[PDB]
Curated annotation (Swiss-Prot), chains A, B:
Glutathione binds at residues 7, 13, 38, 48-50, 62-63. The gene is HPGDS. This is Hematopoietic prostaglandin D synthase. Prostaglandin PGD2 synthesis is stimulated by calcium and magnesium ions. One calcium or magnesium ion is bound between the subunits of the homodimer. The interactions with the protein are for the most part mediated via water molecules. Magnesium increases the affinity for glutathione, while calcium has no effect on the affinity for glutathione. Gene3D superfamilies: 1.20.1050.10, Glutaredoxin.
Length: 198, 198
């Protein structure tokens, strides 16, 4: 297909889509807009949010909807219907956490202390739950890498920016990050992508 | 399999799963717990959250991951892979809004103010986007009912409790509600379920 992904110049909620394209060796236009471009683009989007993915003249939206679409019938999906559910549920558990952060929020009275509350008190419970869920296994679900592993690495990267001691009590969770980053297609993308904070 | 759904005695995040079981005429145990039971239940859960669905002794979590799993290979899924992506995208757009609300906020005055603000300043943009998306079509995606239509009815039922005039400018969204509510298996569940505020 002719794929055009639109997002800010940011990893953000588009990065999961970028990893999937890289891993699958799928070519695409990685369209990154400026903040001053946004207002006029927003009017044309179905629900006024990005990322959007244009597929052969058709517009898809919602990052995880698009990610699931792209990984259907690939080796990233989960090997049984039940394991597909586990993949979706890990992604949604991580997304629920990331979506609690006031990313847009201006007021840095609340924004900072809301961040620091989420990072100091809640992140460790999540980390302990992910660690326990992973146990001694190589990947989060099944016997091979899934896009949930990708999302863990993507989500944990942004979290480690603000709380660099996040994984100090969880070596097994660090190892999983490194495992993902070492997949040649992923490594290649990580090496050549725009360096951005978020 | 044998299914056991655990949630509070509330529609909440479990109701999408309960609609799907009703529509598919699948028997399940509807386990509803009290607050008092919460700490004991929680200790068993993978990520500290309900609903969970136990399936032949194995636990699934995340309401939307579970609903997707249950609708797979059914007429509620979306008739093609692109329609399935649209189903997912509409569901996540609804869920993103519902997740903004401070459901568990202890301070009543702060809770009511945030609800009122979200419903007054934010909801109308979503309702207009959904109306535009639906246009004159019968259902949100494709030519037959999907679990996206279910989730619209379920979400809009709870929002209308707090903002009765929510849909006064959008009769086509009311009509969609009525059509879901008129499906015989869903109508039966609606008539029979425990009556709870939320
Ligand atoms: O920074 C984000 N979003 C963002 C920033 C700014 C603004 N606007 C534009 C200019 C000023 C402003 O407030 C709007 C949205 C963000 C970045 N990563 C993630 C994210 C999600 C999931 C997983 C990982 N990462 N989520 C959100
Ligand atoms: O009221 C909700 N949740 C809720 C309340 C209370 C508590 N308890 C636990 C211990 C203390 C406490 O506060 C936990 C959860 C709720 C209700 N509807 C929805 C919801 C989401 C999506 C679609 C439809 N409906 N989401 C959440
Ligand atoms: N759950 C959606 C979130 C989409 C979303 O809210 N995106 C933000 C940027 S990270 C946005 O476009 N905001 C635009 C606005 O509200 O003006 C997804 O994952 O795609
Ligand atoms: N996105 C998740 C949310 C899970 C969640 O947080 N559920 C709430 C109940 S609505 C919970 O378990 N809360 C415990 C508490 O607030 O004390 C899902 O759809 O299942
Ligand atoms: Mg979500």
């Amino acid at each position: 297909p002719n794929y055009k992904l639109t997002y800010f110049n940011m990893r953000g909620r588009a990065e999961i889509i970028r990893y999937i394209f890289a891993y699958l060796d799928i070519q695409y236009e990685d369209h990154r807009i400026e903040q001053a471009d946004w207002p006029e683009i927003k009017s044309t989007l179905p629900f006024g949010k990005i990322p959007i993915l244009e597929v052969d003249g058709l517009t898809l939206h919602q990052s995880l909807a698009i990610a699931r679409y792209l990984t259907k019938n690939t080796d990233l999906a989960g090997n049984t219907e039940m394991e597909q559910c586990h993949v979706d549920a890990i992604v949604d558990t991580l997304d629920d956490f990331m979506s609690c952060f006031p990313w847009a929020e201006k007021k840095q009275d609340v924004k900072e202390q809301m961040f620091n509350e989420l990072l100091t008190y809640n992140a460790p419970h999540l980390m302990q739950d992910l660690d326990t869920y992973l146990g001694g296994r190589e990947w989060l679900i099944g016997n091979s890498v899934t896009w949930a592993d990708f999302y863990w690495e993507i989500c944990s990267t942004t979290l480690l920016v603000f709380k660099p001691d996040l994984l100090d009590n969880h070596p097994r969770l660090v190892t999983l990050r490194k495992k993902v980053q070492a997949i040649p297609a992923v490594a290649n993308w990580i090496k050549r992508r725009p360096q951005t904070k978020l």
